[PDB]
C-alpha cells in the first residue's frame, strides 16, 4: 500500500517547510525552541548519515538532503540570522537529560547491536522526545508567536498517518517494529500535549 507513510512524510516535510518559511518571511523566531530544532537536526543527521554512502534512488538521496538542509537552515535562522528574536531565557530545557539517556537507551535496547542499528535506534528515540524543549517553553510562557495552526495541522497529520501505517502493515503484512511503535506512540502523545498547550494557552 505504502500510501500512509508517503503522505505522512510529505506532511512532515510540509510542517518543516512552513516553519522555515514562517521564520524567514516574518523575520522572527519568537516562541521557537532552538533546542528542539537542534534535536530534530540531530535526528536527521544520525538517521541519514549514509547519505553520500548508500545510493538507492534520486528521490531518496534528494529527500534526505531536503530534510537536512531545511533543518540546518531553521537552526541557522534561530541562532544566527534572527537570533535577536530568540527567547533563550525561556528555552531553558537541559537537553543533557535527553541526549545522554537516549544514547544509553539506544545501546541497551535495540534490535541488533551494530553501529548502523544503534544509530538508527538513537534517531528513533531522540525524535520521540525532541519536542520536549518546545513543550517546556510554551508551558513556561504561554506563547508561541511563530507556531502557526497549519504547522501544527501537518505535524498532526504526519503522526496520524504513521499510526495508520502501523495498523495497515501489521494487519496486511504481519510487520511490526515494537521499538518504532512504542517510540512513535510517545512522540504522538507528546505532540498531542503540544497541541493542547497551544490551543489552551496561546489561543485562549
Amino acid at each position: 500500500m505504502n500510501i500512509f507513510r508517503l503522505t505522512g512524510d510529505l506532511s512532515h516535510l510540509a510542517a518543516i517547510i512552513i516553519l522555515l518559511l514562517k521564520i524567514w518571511k516574518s523575520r522572527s523566531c519568537a516562541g521557537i525552541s532552538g533546542k528542539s530544532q537542534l534535536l530534530f537536526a540531530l535526528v536527521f543527521t544520525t538517521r541519514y548519515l549514509d547519505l553520500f554512502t548508500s545510493f538507492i534512488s534520486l528521490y531518496n538521496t534528494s529527500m534526505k538532503l531536503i530534510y537536512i538542509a531545511c533543518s540546518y537552515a531553521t537552526v541557522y535562522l534561530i541562532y544566527m540570522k534572527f537570533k535577536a528574536t530568540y527567547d533563550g531565557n525561556h528555552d531553558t530545557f537541559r537537553v543533557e537529560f535527553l541526549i545522554v539517556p537516549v544514547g544509553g537507551l539506544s545501546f541497551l535496547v535495540n534490535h541488533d547491536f551494530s553501529p548502523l542499528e544503534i544509530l538508527w535506534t538513537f534517531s528513533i528515540y531522540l525524535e520521540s522526545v525532541a519536542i520536549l524543549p518546545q513543550l517546556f517553553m510554551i508551558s513556561k510562557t504561554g506563547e508561541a508567536e511563530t507556531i502557526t495552526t497549519h504547522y501544527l495541522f501537518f505535524l498532526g497529520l504526519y503522526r496520524a498517518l504513521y499510526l495508520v501505517n502501523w495498523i495497515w502493515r501489521y494487519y496486511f503484512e504481519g510487520f511490526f517494529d515494537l521499538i518504532a511503535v512504542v517510540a512513535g506512540v510517545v512522540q504522538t502523545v507528546l505532540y498531542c500535549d503540544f497541541f493542547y498547550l497551544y490551543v489552551t494557552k496561546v489561543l485562549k
Partner: nanobody
Amino acid sequence: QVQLVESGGGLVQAGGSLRLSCAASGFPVKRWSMTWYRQAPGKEREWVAAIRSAGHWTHYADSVKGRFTISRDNAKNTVYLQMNSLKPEDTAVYYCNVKDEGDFSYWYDYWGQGTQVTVSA
C-alpha cells in the same frame, strides 16, 4: 534493483514438510524486511511469515503458527521458510517480498516470481 528467486516448492503429502528459499540478487540496502505471502486458487493474497535483516524478530500468521519457521542466512543472500506438517489448505503459490525499511524508499519493494506448493489430501 533487486531480483528475487524462489525455489523449494512442489508436491508433498499431507503431514509432509517442505523448505522454501528466497535468493536475493542485485544491489543491497542496509536495513530490509522480507515477508512470505501465498495466494491459493480463487483466494486473496495473504501474508504468512515475516523477518528483518537483523535481530531475532519473527512473525507468523495464525494459520501457520507452530508449523512454519522463517530463518535468515546472510552468507548466501537467502531467507528460508521451513513448512512442517503441511495440510491441503496450505496449497498456494508462495511469494517472497523484500522491502527497504529505510526512509523515503517507498518503491524499493520487490517480489519473486512465485513457487507452486501443492499438498495432497
